[PDB]
PDB file of C-alpha atoms in Angstrom:
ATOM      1  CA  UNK Y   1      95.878  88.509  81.066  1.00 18.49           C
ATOM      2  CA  UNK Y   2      95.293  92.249  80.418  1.00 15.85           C
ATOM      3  CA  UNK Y   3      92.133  91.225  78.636  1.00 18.13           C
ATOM      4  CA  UNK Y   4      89.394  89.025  81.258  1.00 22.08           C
ATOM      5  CA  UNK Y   5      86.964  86.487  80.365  1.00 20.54           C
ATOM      6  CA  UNK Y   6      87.894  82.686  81.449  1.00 18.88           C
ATOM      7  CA  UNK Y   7      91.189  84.174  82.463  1.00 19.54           C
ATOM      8  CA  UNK Y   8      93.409  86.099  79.482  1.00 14.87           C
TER       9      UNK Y   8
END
């Protein structure tokens, strides 16, 4: 969350 890749 707040950041992308595999889901962050």
């Amino acid at each position: 969350p707040x950041v992308x890749x595999k889901x962050e």
